[PDB]
Amino acid sequence: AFAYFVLSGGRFVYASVLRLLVLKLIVSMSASKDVLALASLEVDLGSIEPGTTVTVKWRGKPVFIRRRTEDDIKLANSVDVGSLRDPQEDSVRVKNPEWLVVVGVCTHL
């Protein structure tokens, strides 16, 4: 009983050492400090003609800006919310009825 008690004390260190070395390798593959220091900025933009799409750059995330015509707004407001895979309304996604500003990265992959 005493021997098992003493051997468990050193087993505490061995498990901790293995956990430290494995974790140190794993975290080394995470985002570096120079990468994290480039994750917040701001960019201003102007205006585009109707019926068009301009792609802007932020930090590896293209942004889609589309000036939608009045006919486009009616076509986007005559759809059933229930059939949508993600239930959402047109108004809650837009401030100006003409300017749609979305990030152009597919949510799939």
């Binding site: 498990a15 956990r19 494995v22 974790l23």
Partner: peptide, 28 residues
């Protein structure tokens, strides 16, 4: 009826080890 207790005992160890390697105290 000791295989079931063996499974439950090893499940606690697997849970204890999981909370030990990954320490998600700032996530719970």
């Amino acid at each position: 009826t000791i295989d079931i207790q063996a499974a439950a005992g090893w499940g606690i160890a697997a849970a204890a080890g999981a909370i030990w390697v990954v320490q998600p105290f700032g996530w719970i």
